[PDB]
Design a protein around this ligand. Structure first.
Ligand SMILES: N[C@@H](Cc1ccc(O)cc1)C(=O)O
Ligand SMILES: N[C@@H](Cc1ccc(O)cc1)C(=O)O
Ligand SMILES: [Zn+2]
Ligand SMILES: [Zn+2]
Ligand SMILES: [Zn+2]
Ligand SMILES: [Zn+2]
Lengths: 286, 287
């Protein structure tokens, strides 16, 4: 309960500056890249092989995997500066803006802006602009330049709304067989964004575009973490509301998806991260 | 000191059985595939990106990375049968045979045999024959069966010899700048196999062929582990002989290669595994 994760819009200029600086150091040290690889590798780890479930997405472990992922990143941040915490991008309130690109998360001081059409949508403003920040591809080879392309897709022209989130919070079951894309009456699947998708989480990924639009390259953009903090916040609120309702499958699902299964690439199980406050943090709104 | 790793050739029939049995259970549970993936994932993790060093190969971490790999695997074995331990394949003595494919390590009771050239070198005997043991490809999807093609290659027609091993043990430096394929006068690089390559570890991979011949799929073949147990034994012997030589680089090598850097995909450092007795095991030759 001690460490607090705040809304990006509640951050002081100094907090924003320290968050960015710390990410740059993690990047320079070689630590950041381990995060990009972990997520891509988990992306190709199928449970079981032959199915479209993977260790980190399209399945029940989606939520505890990204929560373990964010936890480990935050400790890495804290090992550089013990006061830094992971903030969250509350995209549903940015959804209300006539032009979400004008949200303060996109200023030079922070995430930097949308891609520049003149430069094939390479990001050329902020701390992560090309020349300042290097990217890798799916093979783990250098790839020269962060790209973004807000709302350029007919499948994801807008950010999700507060109503979408509210609507997800009403669902009663964590998850339902067969624990995948096609799971219905499923909070997990609704949040991930496959029900009549792309919605919510999935929708944000494709709204941003650039490297964020595809699983293997998505954490090349530091906003990935800010997005996933918000997702983890939503799940936490859902856990607060539906206090009785627990994780499913508790057993008999695909290995890696059950309550006490190792989540590749780690030994951590969903049980280990089921209650976030036990992990040392709460979100400000708590 | 208190768990012993034995030469495969010294195993009893009931020891052979229990090892094979345990691996099959790891496979069935979903545990075994985590190791295939771990190894493939590390192979794609370049230190630094751009270079041809990676987290598990072609660099100083090659040896401790595989030691940690094996340790985890063994613990997973022991969680099924706390009496089971990783045996090793002493390929240098198999090399003495006019034809190494007749070795008992390829018996139907253990690793099974060479590939069937009628079926594109699919292994069709032993516990791991096609239809008893499903394989995965580089993308994580089923690939339809173990393949082996012993010594079918010009570059690797033979197993490495006892003399090859002895000559690697003469080298004084653990490794040398720039900590990769081109490193000279380097125990690491020599044992790995890039000095007039493929020698030693690398030559073994290519001599077996099939999935063993390629980085992303090599661990599909359980002999991968018996192979690396021999590699780990050879390193441990080098560490005994040169008791005052330590891991290199200590610092200013690429991140992930230094003595106290985490080895992707773990937080484990080379220092964490530099003393194998501290890890709880010993090779039978030490006794
Ligand atoms: N694959 C998701 C989008 C997505 C992209 C990157 C991720 O890490 C996760 C999800 C979709 O089909 O809509
Ligand atoms: N790359 C080695 C062969 C090899 C195959 C699989 C491995 O895991 C490791 C090495 C060579 O070129 O000789
Ligand atoms: Zn995501
Ligand atoms: Zn993802
Ligand atoms: Zn190898
Ligand atoms: Zn290998």
């Amino acid at each position: 309960k001690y460490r607090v994760r705040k809304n990006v819009l509640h951050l002081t200029d100094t907090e924003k500056r320290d968050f960015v600086r710390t990410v740059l150091i993690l990047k320079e040290k070689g630590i950041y890249d381990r995060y990009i690889a972990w997520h891509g590798a988990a992306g190709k780890f199928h449970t079981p092989p032959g199915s479209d479930r993977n260790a980190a997405h399209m399945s029940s472990a989606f939520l505890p995997w990204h929560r373990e992922y964010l936890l480990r990143f935050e400790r890495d941040l804290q090992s550089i500066n013990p006061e830094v915490t992971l903030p969250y991008w509350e995209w549903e309130t940015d959804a209300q803006m006539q032009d979400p690109s004008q949200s303060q998360i996109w200023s030079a001081d922070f995430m930097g802006g949308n891609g520049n059409p003149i430069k094939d949508f390479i990001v050329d403003t902020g701390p992560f602009a090309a020349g300042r920040w290097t990217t890798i591809d799916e093979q783990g080879n250098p790839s020269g330049g962060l790209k973004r392309n807000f709302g350029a897709t007919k499948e994801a022209p807008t950010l999700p709304t507060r109503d979408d989130v509210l609507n997800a919070l009403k669902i009663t079951q964590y998850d339902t067989p067969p624990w995948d894309m096609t799971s219905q009456n499923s909070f997990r699947n609704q949040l991930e964004g496959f029900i009549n998708g792309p919605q919510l989480h999935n929708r944000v990924h494709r709204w941003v575009g650039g490297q964020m639009g595809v699983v293997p390259t998505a954490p090349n953009d530091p906003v990935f973490f800010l997005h996933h903090a918000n997702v983890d916040r939503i799940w936490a609120v859902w856990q607060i509301i539906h206090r009785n309702q627990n994780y499913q499958p508790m057993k008999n699902g695909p290995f890696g998806q059950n309550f006490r299964d190792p989540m590749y690439p780690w030994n951590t199980t969903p049980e280990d991260v089921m209650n976030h406050r036990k992990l040392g943090y709460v979100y400000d709104i708590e």
